[PDB]
Amino acid sequence: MQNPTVFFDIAVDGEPLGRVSFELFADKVPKTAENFRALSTGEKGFGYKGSCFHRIIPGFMCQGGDFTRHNGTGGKSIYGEKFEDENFILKHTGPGILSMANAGPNTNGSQFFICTAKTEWLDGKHVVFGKVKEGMNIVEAMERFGSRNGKTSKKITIADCGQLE
């Protein structure tokens, strides 16, 4: 019927920058789509407010999803430690696509990233479903503050998180 959208209020150096919306294919991938927005909704109670992007890399993508420790660890899904990939119907067609990062097969757990460039080398193993409806210009901004080491020159936090439609 509808494609749930979620967004993050990104603030740099204690001040707001903008918001980014995302289009999730619930019909195509009900498993990842519900889990993906579920974390934002905080139905289970994660309620990650102000969480900063766990890891950002320039010329590749912005990695995040870790809200409990913000160190790439402690992240967890509503179902449990990890969940299976629904399918690879939607691939890394282009930039702005949101994908569920994992440490291996069927180990998605809690972790997703916003790609900035087409990653064919990531496709075929990493389940992916999502795109930026609007606010990419903001995503790129976050990428600018990213580094090879994964650390950010500035401080990116989520001023507010909720379910958009």
**HEC-encoded secondary structure of the chain:** CCCCEEEEEEEECCEEEEEEEEECCCCCCHHHHHHHHHHHHCCCCCCCCCCECCEEECCCEEEECCCCCCCCCCCCCCCCCCCCCCCCCCCCCCCCCEECCCCCCCCCCCCEEEECCCCCCCCCCCCECCEEEECHHHHHHHHHCCCCCCCCCCCEEEEEEEEEC
Catalytic site residue from 22, 122, 129, 145: 122
Tokens 């930026």 sit at which residue? Answer: 132
Is 164 designated active site?
no
Is 113 designated active site?
yes
What are the structure tokens assigned to 165, written together?
């439609």
Question: 65 lies in which domain range?
Answer: 1-165
Which residues are CB-contacts of 33 (< 8 A; sequence separation ≥ 6)? 4, 24, 25, 26, 129
Is 126 designated active site?
yes
CB 33 within 8 A of CB 153: no
CB 115 within 8 A of CB 99: yes
How far apart CA 156 and CA 142 sit, in angstroms, is 8
Is 53 designated active site?
no
Is 102 designated active site?
yes
Residue 20, number of CB atoms within 10 A of its CB: 24
Is 87 designated active site?
no
Experimental method: NMR
Gyration radius of the chain's alpha carbons = 14
Catalytic site residue from 8, 35, 36, 63: 63
User: Nearest to residue 100, comparing CAs of 118, 116, 81, 122?
Assistant: 122
The number of domains in the chain is: 1
CB 29 within 8 A of CB 87: yes
Tokens 């498993």 sit at which residue? Answer: 31
What are the structure tokens assigned to 51, written together?
């969480």
Catalytic site residue from 3, 19, 60, 164: 60
CB 135 within 8 A of CB 20: yes
